[PDB]
Every structure is written in structure tokens, then in C-alpha cells.
Amino acid sequence: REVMANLTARVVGAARRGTLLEKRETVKSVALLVVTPDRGLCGSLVAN
Amino acid sequence: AEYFRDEGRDILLFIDNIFRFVQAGSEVSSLLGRMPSQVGYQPTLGTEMGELQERITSTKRGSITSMQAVYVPADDYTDPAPATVFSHLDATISLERSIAERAIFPAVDPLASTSRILDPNIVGEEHYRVAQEVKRVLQRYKDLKDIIAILGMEELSDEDKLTVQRARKIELFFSQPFTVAQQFTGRPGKYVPVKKTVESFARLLNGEGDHIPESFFYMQGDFDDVLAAYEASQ
């Protein structure tokens, strides 16, 4: 994390940051990673 | 009442605590020296009940619309007196203490209450379907009482959760203020026609009113009153 902090403090170039660090303006497609317990009895978490 | 029935006049007959009739027979038999049967009751319980009840019949000369009350000793529905009454009725309405202790003052248990005229030819197809669905719901609820009691609401499936929510809403909605209950309850009495009741329960079963909290179904008339209360609460 502090490695991210230091490196991003530099290489601020948008073209340089075009790799992943770039913010897509259109945001036409999005993706959600959902991590859900595998077995139930968990309570209200699986649903929440 | 038989004189008025025999001349053709329709009779509304209201007997109170047919049980008390049976309990007295029991005391009379005990003093008469008869051999006791079951829990101290008279040996001639069935015959006495028959002799009294078979006179409460609508004949071809006139009709008697009879409404009776029966007191269950303690809370035992297997007592010989109610068990003997049960076979002498066209419509049975079972009031349970557990429902009453939930402030549901009508206190009628839908699953333990039946009627012979609940027939699509007699009462109507829509009424019959609504009643059968209102029993199938709350039967799914009675089947899941222990799972909700121990594990909780979460373990049920989505459709099971929906049926349980609708069942509890239906339990609250069966409650209804009475005009004669103003003495100890501040709710004004409500008279819901059978058509309004059927329409309200059909709308509740369809899904309308799902968003409404259950507390708004308590002491209400038809579904329009519940919707108006919800709008008042915004």
C-alpha cells in the first residue's frame, strides 16, 4: 500500500497511468466481485 | 322455538355454552349414581347430546338458523363434551387462547375452523379459491413454526419467506374490531361484507400490500382501510 502511495505520487501522467490506473470516462460496463459464504446457517450475512 | 319453526317462521337460535348443558347432565348423573365414564362424565353423554341437538334442525316446514357456543374445559379440545358436539354441526369455529393472547380478539383459528357450505357451488368459485389459498397459506406457516422458532427466518427459502410474511399478515388481518367491544377497546366497530372480505384477501394473496408493514393489518376492516392507514402513515 505505501508502495502504491509512493509510486502513484510519481508517474502521474494520464497516458502513463492509461494502464489500469486509468479511469474509464464512459463506465459503460462495470463488474462486481461478490464473495459469499459457501455454506448457509451463516445467519443474515449471505442475504445482506 | 319448534312452534315457530313448525308454522314456517324462520328462527335464529342462539344457545349459550352447550357445554354447560353437558356439565349439568354430568352432575345430575353423578348424583343419580350412574357409572361414570371418561373424566367423570355421564355414561349417557352421546344420547343426551343427540336428543338435544337433533331437535335443532331446519325441516321442510321451517328453518332454524342455529348458532351455538361451546366451552372447552381448560383448553382441551379432546374433552368428551366438545368432541361430542363436533359431529353435530354444519360449521365449526375454533377459538384458540394462543391467538387470543396475541391481541387477536376474534381469536378464530382458520386451520381448525371448517364449514360444510364452503363449496364453490354454494359460496362461489372466487370465495372458495380465496378460502382454500388462505388455508394453504398458514398451513405452510404452521409447517414452519419450529424452523422459525429455532433457526430463524433467514434459513427459509425466498418463496417460503414470502409465504410466511403473507401468513403473518393474514393472521393480523383476520383481526377485526367489534361494535360491542367499545367498552374495553377504543377501536370503532367494523362491518365487512363477505364480498369485501373475499376481495381484500384475494388482493393480499396476489401481492398487493406486500410493502405494507404487518402492524397496519391489525384491527382493520377491508383492504381499503389498510391502504388508507398506510397512506396516512406515508
Side-chain angles (χ1 to χ4, degrees), chain B residues 76-97:
Chain B
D76 208 313
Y77 275 87
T78 75
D79 181 77
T84 309
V85 181
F86 276 129
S87 67
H88 277 114
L89 302 177
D90 294 354
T92 294
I93 297 167
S94 299
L95 274 60
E96 300 265 357
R97 171 173 261 89

Side-chain angles (χ1 to χ4, degrees), chain B residues 219-234:
Chain B
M219 293 315 174
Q220 301 285 347
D222 60 333
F223 201 70
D224 294 349
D225 295 13
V226 184
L227 275 178
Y230 184 38
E231 296 325 294
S233 82
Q234 293 179 356

Side-chain angles (χ1 to χ4, degrees), chain A residues 5-46:
Chain A
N6 296 142
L7 195 154
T8 50
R10 283 78 271 268
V11 200
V12 300
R16 299 185 290 181
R17 293 175 163 182
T19 61
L20 226 54
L21 212 160
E22 182 275 358
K23 48 179 180 58
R24 317 291 168 186
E25 177 182 2
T26 67
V27 204
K28 179 56 186 62
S29 175
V30 179
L32 189 58
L33 272 278
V34 278
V35 36
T36 49
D38 197 351
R39 288 177 50 268
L41 282 159
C42 327
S44 62
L45 253 65
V46 165

